[PDB]
Write an enzyme that holds these catalytic residues in place. Structure first.
Site, mmCIF file in Angstrom:
data_model
loop_
_atom_site.group_PDB
_atom_site.id
_atom_site.type_symbol
_atom_site.label_atom_id
_atom_site.label_comp_id
_atom_site.label_asym_id
_atom_site.label_seq_id
_atom_site.Cartn_x
_atom_site.Cartn_y
_atom_site.Cartn_z
ATOM 1 C CG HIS A 40 -9.888 -38.150 11.339
ATOM 2 N ND1 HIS A 40 -9.564 -37.228 12.674
ATOM 3 C CD2 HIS A 40 -8.858 -38.762 10.945
ATOM 4 C CE1 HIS A 40 -8.504 -37.235 12.700
ATOM 5 N NE2 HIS A 40 -7.819 -38.687 11.931
ATOM 6 C CG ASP A 84 -11.865 -35.457 14.247
ATOM 7 O OD1 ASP A 84 -12.413 -36.707 13.981
ATOM 8 O OD2 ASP A 84 -10.898 -35.256 13.798
ATOM 9 N N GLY A 175 1.111 -37.125 13.170
ATOM 10 C CA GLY A 175 1.842 -37.288 14.041
ATOM 11 C C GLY A 175 1.162 -38.497 15.179
ATOM 12 C CB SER A 177 -5.222 -39.903 13.138
ATOM 13 O OG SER A 177 -4.923 -39.101 11.845
ATOM 14 N N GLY A 178 -6.269 -39.567 16.218
ATOM 15 C CA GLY A 178 -6.942 -40.321 17.147
ATOM 16 C C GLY A 178 -6.733 -40.246 18.532
#
Ligand code: CA
Length: 223
Positions: A40, A84, A175, A177-178
């Site tokens: 995402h 994801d 908080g 992403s990734g």
């Protein structure tokens, strides 16, 4: 500090910032040429930024490297956030030291109640908009699958896990992403999603990296 705290500069040397003119997502260095992140977080023209602490200030330990490639997981579903996970190749190999290091891939999946380290730059406010500028950290246990799924009925797959507290308060919703979830020195998680934001019975939701290890190794060796 019971929850979100300031890591300390370069205490998490595998932590990467993905930059498109701004910091938009986190990621983890898995070897000198490769980064794993969330699918995402897929974007054109990434610059991967290593050895960061304050992402607005040039503090002397940085390495700035353009992404050459991105490979989103073939079964990524952007509706459900199932699978994801994305791999990002560096145009040039990073230079490895005390503050720029790789994180190992798991050899097995980690169990419920295992304490993990979650890191990133992203939003601190369950109720508002507050984005801090140095690396933030959180220690939380992995929740039981039951506890995870009953918080998000019909929404949790085998390729996900939850971490934190069923009372909420302490969570990584937006908080960052990734970004990584690391448990016993191994990369177990990728900061994926979380409906609400540190709400009572709304934990953080992570991509279960231990399901993808053969994919990651095969893909990076072939690319
Ligand atoms: Ca910096």
């Amino acid at each position: 500090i019971v929850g979100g705290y300031t890591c300390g500069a370069n205490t998490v040397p595998y932590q990467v910032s993905l930059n498109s003119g701004y910091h938009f997502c986190g990621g983890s260095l898995i070897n000198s040429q490769w980064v794993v992140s969330a699918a995402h977080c897929y974007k054109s023209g990434i610059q991967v930024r290593l050895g960061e602490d304050n992402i607005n200030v040039v503090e002397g330990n940085e390495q700035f490297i353009s992404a050459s490639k991105s490979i989103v997981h073939p079964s990524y579903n952007s509706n459900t956030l199932n699978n994801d996970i994305m791999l990002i190749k560096l145009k040039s190999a990073a230079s490895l030291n005390s503050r720029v290091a790789s994180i190992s891939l798991p050899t097995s999946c980690a169990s419920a109640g295992t304490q993990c380290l979650i890191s990133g730059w992203g939003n601190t406010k369950s109720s508002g908009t507050s984005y801090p500028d140095v690396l933030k950290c959180l220690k939380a246990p992995i929740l039981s699958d039951s506890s995870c799924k009953s918080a998000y009925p019909g929404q949790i797959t085998s390729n996900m896990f939850c971490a934190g507290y069923l009372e909420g308060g302490k969570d990584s919703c937006q908080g960052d992403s990734g970004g990584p979830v690391v448990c016993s020195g191994k990369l177990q998680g990728i900061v994926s999603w979380g409906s609400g934001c540190a709400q009572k019975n709304k934990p953080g939701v992570y991509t279960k990296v231990c399901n993808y290890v053969s994919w990651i190794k095969q893909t990076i060796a072939s690319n």
